[PDB]
């Protein structure tokens, strides 16, 4: 097939990665706001840690769901269960491009006939959520800055932090749009056709 | 998702926090009308200290009781034993028009009870201290109280004009905040 | 006490008022993005008019459904069909507070006994939808400005319109929030 | 809702709008490259005009066919001809979402059932091509700039034009990507 993301995350079950990379990002958000870093997230005393984690996760998902070159599995072949005919829509999946295949209850559902059972494999273009050490630097900068900005604004309101972050976010956001101009916006309009 | 307030204050029993952050805000009110700061709020004498503290508390409650992103818990769970659930001093409001406070206890008015089969998940507004809210809100609250304290007891004109400008600026910033974060509904 | 909303709209059968007030509010959204006003909302079949009207309706219902001093009736008594014993939950009703009565059909369904059907006898806190000339000016301005901003953003994307409308919405919200704090608690 | 595109274009006969908005966009491509504007798009004569118009149409179709909040009708109802059962797949139609219905030879074709004839109306999610004055400003700027760059690159090769157009495209794309994330 085609190019894949750095992380496949096939066994992700929770909303969060629970990783060193996620901790580092949350610790950056805390720092921005004047709070000292923690050694684990998991574990679950403070409101500020929990809130930063949540804000970060939502922004991460919102930006990644658009779909970009680094988080796209260009030609993913999905094979149904032999007995049930089912294909799980796994928790790390953000979207199947095209408007035909959607998540219904944790299962890939085909709108062309109205079914979640398949007699053979399907090949689709899939967006898979990546962790912060699995994306280009410009994306980690845009997501973690945007999250820091929101965390500041919602709970703290330090204006020097806001002015500073607004500028860093603008710059990362321009860099991510320059990326997309180089790599292209995937459109479903196999790998060869994916021409756009 | 769900985000919580920075302060939970479950063991708050009085009307006041009694914190350093409270003292700093009262001291700003006193400075605004030319009185000197105090090192504690534990009843000192001083009618001006007491009055500032009370005006500040009332304005704080009034503003915070509207419900804002920073003091709303969208999924707070309250477990009742005796069936009963206390409505604590830090609770301002449970949104939605079903549960309310009956002399210190949560009253479920879908059934007219205040005893509960299990536990409940509600949307709850909880009073935050001055170091637990965004700067714009502290500014609005503290400036509004300062102005009220001036007008009620002193009436200095240059204070009034100055505070009025600051209150208006804070109030715009708080309305911008809510446009960014949204008003909760249901 | 008991004060009532200015509009009860019992005969309202579809989603829209169809009123002169609605027409004015739509013409205002049209003026904001540079289009000409219309003389009626009974189109054919201008897309812009249909879209403005839907967006405006949705925002109106959304903001009003919170419940405010101007659109709550703390003791609305509703009376059944008798025969069927059935109480409609009408287009103009946004919600019944308290947690017991809810919209099944709509009807009206007592979620604490059965039961779609009633002997008489029912008194209730009702939030009812007001028309654009039946609310305080600040709420009309909020609803219309917010609707105008969604209409712009989705279909037009004019940056100066957005900036200007955003400061108008903020002004309206500042007045509605004073209203909410003044009448509430 | 319930919301519909600004333009339905049910009577478009060919690939092009023929409109003042189309003319103005082609004139902008001509200006980017140092050529004078024209008063109309079919005379013809002009190779540059014909090529700019084709490039612009192709880019316009390609970007729009993704489907956006401004050009999706979530419940378009299409009604078959009574005698024939057929439903034309019109030139302004870009796609029908879901994987069931496609354009086969100019007719709406249900590829799941394996039929292009229908006993009554169908209601579908239709993406319909908008004119340059019927889309949000950031999309017109994206499409016209992109088209300008392809026209330059293929026939002119002016490097200063490419550098300046590439900045303006990036700026437009940034606004269109905020739109996509805001309306997604």
Which chain A residues touch B if contact means CB-CB below 8 Å?
A: 47-48, 50-51, 54-55, 57-58, 153-159
- Does B96 sit behind a cis peptide bond, omega within 30 degrees of 0 on the bond before it? no
Q: Determine, for residues B66 and C112 on separate chains, whether the beta-carbon distance falls below 8 Å.
A: no
Closest CA to D23 of D46, D67, D1, D56: D56
Strand partners, C88: C107
Q: Which two tokens stand for residue A188?
A: 């479903």
User: Quick one: which H or E segment has residue D110?
Assistant: strand D107-110
User: Quick one: closest CA in D to C152, which residue?
Assistant: D136
Three state DSSP letters for A120-171:
CCEEEEEEECCCCCCCCHHHHHHHHHHHHHHHHHHHCCCHHHHHHHHHHHHH
Strand partners, B99: B108
In whole angstroms, what is the distance from residue A67 CA to residue A74 CA? 11
In whole angstroms, what is the distance from residue C74 CA to residue B97 CA? 12
Residues contacting residue A30 through CB under 8 Å, at least 6 positions apart:
A36, A37, A38, A48, A49, A52
Contact (Cβ atoms closer than 8 angstroms) between residue A125 and residue B104 = no
Partner residue opposite D98 with nearest CB, options A100, A173, A178 = A100
Residues contacting residue C177 through CB under 8 Å, at least 6 positions apart:
B66, B175, B178
Q: DSSP assignment, residue D132?
A: T
User: Quick one: which H or E segment has residue D174?
Assistant: helix D159-182
Residues contacting residue A177 through CB under 8 Å, at least 6 positions apart:
D170, D173, D174, D177
Partner residue opposite D98 with nearest CB, options A111, A173, A180 = A111
Contact (Cβ atoms closer than 8 angstroms) between residue C89 and residue C25 = no
Three state DSSP letters for chain B:
CCCCCCCCCCCCCCCCCCCHHHHHHHHHHHHHCCCCCCCCCCCCCCHHHHHHHHHHHHHHHHHHHCCCHHHEEEEEEECCCCCCCECCCCEEEECCCCEEEECCEEEECCCCECCCCCCEEEEEEECCCCCCCCHHHHHHHHHHHHHHHHHHHCCCHHHHHHHHHHHHHHHHHHHHHHHHHCCCCC
In whole angstroms, what is the distance from residue C45 CA to residue D10 CA? 13
Alpha helices in C33-136 (DSSP H): 47-65
Instruction: Please name the method used to determine this structure.
Output: X-ray
Place of tokens 């939950």: C89
Per-domain residue ranges of chain C: 10-71+130-185, 72-129
Nearest-Cα distance to chain A for B31, in Å, is: 23
In whole angstroms, what is the distance from residue C156 CA to residue C153 CA? 6
Strand partners, C96: C126
User: Quick one: closest CA in B to C126, which residue?
Assistant: B97
Q: DSSP assignment, residue D34?
A: T
The CB density around residue A120, as the number of other CB atoms within 10 Å, is: 7
Q: Determine, for residues A99 and D100 on separate chains, whether the beta-carbon distance falls below 8 Å.
A: no
| CA-to-CA dists, residue C60 to B170, B175, C14, C31, C63, angstroms | 28, 19, 15, 19, 6
Q: Choose the mutation target among A56, A59, A150, A157 for the interface with B, i.e. most B CBs under 10 Å.
A: A157
| CA-to-CA dists, residue B70 to A26, A157, B141, B154, angstroms | 19, 11, 14, 34
Q: Show residues of chain A in contact with D177, CB under 8 Å.
A: 66, 177, 180
User: E strands of C25-164, at which residues?
Assistant: 72-78, 93-96, 101-103, 108-110, 122-128
Contact (Cβ atoms closer than 8 angstroms) between residue A76 and residue A126 = yes
Nearest-Cα distance to chain C for B146, in Å, is: 18
User: Quick one: closest CA in C to D176, which residue?
Assistant: C157
In whole angstroms, what is the distance from residue D170 CA to residue D166 CA? 6
Closest CA to C117 of C104, C99, C129: C104
Q: Determine, for residues B3 and A51 on separate chains, whether the beta-carbon distance falls below 8 Å.
A: yes
Interface contacts B/C by beta carbons within 8 Å: 49
Nearest-Cα distance to chain C for B179, in Å, is: 8
Q: Determine, for residues B6 and A154 on separate chains, whether the beta-carbon distance falls below 8 Å.
A: no
Contact (Cβ atoms closer than 8 angstroms) between residue A172 and residue A58 = no
User: E strands of C80-158, at which residues?
Assistant: 93-96, 101-103, 108-110, 122-128
Residues contacting residue C124 through CB under 8 Å, at least 6 positions apart:
C75, C76, C77, C78, C96, C98, C101
Q: Determine, for residues B70 and A158 on separate chains, whether the beta-carbon distance falls below 8 Å.
A: no
Contact (Cβ atoms closer than 8 angstroms) between residue C107 and residue C89 = yes
In whole angstroms, what is the distance from residue B30 CA to residue C117 CA? 63
Instruction: State residue B147 phi and psi, 5-degree precision.
Output: -70, -40
User: Quick one: closest CA in B to A51, which residue?
Assistant: B3
Which chain B residues touch A if contact means CB-CB below 8 Å?
A: 1-8, 69-70, 134-137, 177, 180-181
Chains B and A touch (3+ CB pairs under 8 A): yes
Contact (Cβ atoms closer than 8 angstroms) between residue D88 and residue D11 = no
């Amino acid at each position: 097939s085609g190019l894949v993301p750095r992380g496949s995350h096939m066994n992700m079950q929770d909303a969060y990665f629970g990783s060193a990379a996620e901790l580092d990002a949350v610790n950056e958000m805390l720092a921005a706001i004047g709070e000292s870093p923690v050694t684990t997230l998991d574990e679950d005393g403070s409101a500020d840690v929990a809130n930063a984690r949540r804000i970060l996760n939502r922004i991460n998902r919102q930006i990644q769901s658009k779909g970009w070159a680094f988080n796209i599995n260009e030609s993913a072949t999905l094979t149904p269960d032999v007995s049930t005919g089912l294909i799980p829509f796994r928790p790390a999946y953000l979207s199947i491009l095209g408007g035909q295949y959607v998540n219904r209850g944790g299962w890939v559902y085909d709108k062309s006939t109205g079914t979640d059972t398949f007699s053979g494999p399907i090949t689709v273009t899939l967006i898979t959520l990546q962790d912060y050490d699995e994306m280009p630097e410009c994306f980690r900068q845009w997501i973690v800055t945007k999250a820091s900005r929101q965390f500041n604004s919602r709970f703290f309101g330090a204006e020097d932090v806001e002015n500073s972050l607004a500028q860093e976010e603008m710059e990362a956001r321009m860099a991510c749009n320059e990326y997309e101009m180089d790599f292209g916006q995937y459109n479903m309009l196999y790998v060869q056709g994916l021409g756009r």
